[PDB]
Paper text:
[name] ([name]) catalyzes the first reaction in the glycolytic pathway and is a target for regulation in a wide range of organisms. In the ternary complex, phosphate is bound adjacent to glucose, and the B factors for the α4, α5 and α9 helices were further reduced, while r.m.s.d. spikes were observed at the end of the β10 sheet and within the α6 helix of the β-domain. This structural characterization suggests that phosphate could influence the activity of [name] by altering glucose binding and modulating interactions with a loop-interacting regulatory protein.
Here, we report the crystal structure of [name] [name] ([name]), which has phosphate bound in the cleft between the α and β domains adjacent to the active site. The phosphate-bound complex is composed of a dimer, with each monomer featuring an α/β domain characterized by noncontiguous segments: the small domain (residues 2–110 and 300–321) and the large domain (residues 111–299). The phosphate-binding site is found on the edge of the small and large domain cleft outside the α4–α10 cluster. Arg286 is also important for stabilization through phosphate interaction and undergoes significant structural changes upon binding. The guanidinium group of Arg286 moves closer to the phosphate, allowing the formation of several stabilizing hydrogen bonds. His183, Ser185 and Glu187 exhibit distinct conformational changes upon phosphate binding. Diffraction data were collected at 2.63 Å resolution for the phospate-bound form (Rwork/Rfree = 0.191/0.230) and at 2.54 Å resolution for the ternary complex (Rwork/Rfree = 0.202/0.258), both at 297 K. A B-factor analysis of the phosphate-bound [name] structure revealed consistently lower values for phosphate-interacting basic residues in the α4, α5 and α9 helices, while significant root-mean-square deviation (r.m.s.d.) spikes indicated flexibility in regions preceding β1 and within the loop between the β5 and β6 sheets of the α domain.
Numbering used by the authors:
A (entry chain B), B (entry chain A): 2 to 321
The structure:
């Protein structure tokens, strides 16, 4: 058959599309609100009837941990067993992968207009790749090319210990360690991480924080209306660089460091002028090591759908 | 041919031996001093004539980064070209790998008597593996099993930003940051790292350090004759755990975390009584994640010779 089902479920939104098995091309993308449907398979059934095409294979990416037949969404009230949905749909293959796996698998399919470069030279072919994004949480994955095939290396890299460098970063660690216990990088590189950076900075002045959400941190920083909001956003960009620099040092990722969407596009212009690349290269003797490594921001509209098709096609035996 | 030459060359000494291409067994190992011979070629020639063996393939592990055809070592008189040496020796395959790459490739060859487990459950076959060792510097490598083949991922992971967790670790960062600026993990997890920890502890207590070498720190700590040295060795063991746990989270190293010799065997009993494993699992919500990941200390005599044979045999088509 010519088409397989591809998906990208991210909380309240379920995006489904058709993927050409021969080419990996995505088409007929439809987005359904998860609040209007009781199950993911209910959406898939509605989508399959509308396009009147027969599919036997499928690969859906979900923004939740996937290990075990029972997939449970972070807050959304969708939970299912992969085998039950496999039997109910009559599917030959039903791949259910983490959303960050799919995003990493889309990188071999991306062209340069889907990327924005932040410093560095050209990538080195055949070298490892680091992918990380700061959204609701801190997703981290790695990409390695072995024998014409792309293997995805998953993990929970977002929960490694936060590593402060400057003075200002050290006071933040001290404040957070007093409230929470171990302080992971996710506590400062994420949606809630922006608030944590804000709340820590306000308490650094021996004051009490004001209650506002990450969306209020961003536009107040961009409007120059709250001095603390711009301070936290600038520190968030610096910490994003330091984190990305550690990733490149650890795995020698001369294929590139990729930022996967998240909250960064909400302040793209502010991010462009920050000390992100400076903190990325602030590695002591090994600035020259990561100096030439390029950092790209993925601006492709649907990397989850693209990478789900790439992973499924490789599963079925195609070479990307 | 039955035998291939394998080698493990450092700053001053070159160890060469024979590898049974069928079994991977290392035999007839001899160490030569690089001050008595003008080139690495000369040492290989005298070995092959004083052992009367006749090899066609060889693989040598060198304690310096391998970037290109020219190998620039610490023994500058021995700097050579890979292609030139291959033509001079008449070899059909001459693989030149980093010393820490060879140690990581010894993992598939190691028996139970060469490993001491430090916590964790059984390893999961086919899952990634993290290797690190604290010697003169901090070497970090990763192993991935793809299509019946073991691939080594090199990097400079020992130079990522040091991540303090406890309040005592935070003050160490402040002390060192005022001296050298960027504080990588190598500045605490190494032979010189012991001295740095010792100086930072006494400086935190408003006292003046002595001019001690790493061997002094371990000696006083094991003899309980210096509380400063004892605290330094205790903190080293704890930071050793935290660093390894960060590696495990980042790449999901369910195939195990391996400590490659270094200075740890010199205080093995002190290491066993330390809070190493507890610091390894001090990962907040993800203590349960790294709880099942096993940690092994490698106590093999010559892992570089063992791993060099493994890499060469894999390159020659054999499956480990």
């Amino acid at each position: 058959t010519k088409y397989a089902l591809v998906g990208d479920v991210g909380g309240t939104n379920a995006r489904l599309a058709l993927c050409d098995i021969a080419s990996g091309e995505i088409s007929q993308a439809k987005t359904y609100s998860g609040l209007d449907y009781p199950s993911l398979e209910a959406v898939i059934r509605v989508y399959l009837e509308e396009h009147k095409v027969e599919v036997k294979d499928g690969c859906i990416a979900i923004a939740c941990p996937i290990t075990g037949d029972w997939v449970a969404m972070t807050n959304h009230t969708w939970a299912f067993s992969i085998a039950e949905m496999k039997k109910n749909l009559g599917f030959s293959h039903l791949e259910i992968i983490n959303d960050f796996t799919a995003v990493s698998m889309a990188i071999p399919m991306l062209k340069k207009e889907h990327l924005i470069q932040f410093g560095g030279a050209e990538p080195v072919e055949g070298k490892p790749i680091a992918v990380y994004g700061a959204g609701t949480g801190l997703g981290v994955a790695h990409l390695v090319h072995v024998d014409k095939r792309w293997v995805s290396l998953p993990g929970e890299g977002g929960h490694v210990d936060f590593a402060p460098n400057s003075e200002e970063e050290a006071i933040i660690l001290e404040i957070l360690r007093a409230e929470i216990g171990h302080v992971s990088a996710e506590r400062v590189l994420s949606g809630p991480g922006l608030v944590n950076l804000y709340r820590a900075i306000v308490k650094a002045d021996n004051r009490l924080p004001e209650n506002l959400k990450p969306k209020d941190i961003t536009e107040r920083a961009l409007a120059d209306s709250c001095t603390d909001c711009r301070r936290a956003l600038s520190l968030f960009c610096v910490i994003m660089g330091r984190f990305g620099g550690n990733l490149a040092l650890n795995l020698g990722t001369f294929g590139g460091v990729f930022i996967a969407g998240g909250i960064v596009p909400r302040f793209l212009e502010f991010f462009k002028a920050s000390g992100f690349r400076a903190a990325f290269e602030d590695k002591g003797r090994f600035k020259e090591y990561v100096h030439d490594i390029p950092v790209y921001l993925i601006v492709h509209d649907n990397p989850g759908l693209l990478g789900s098709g790439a992973h499924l096609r490789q599963t079925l035996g195609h070479i990307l």
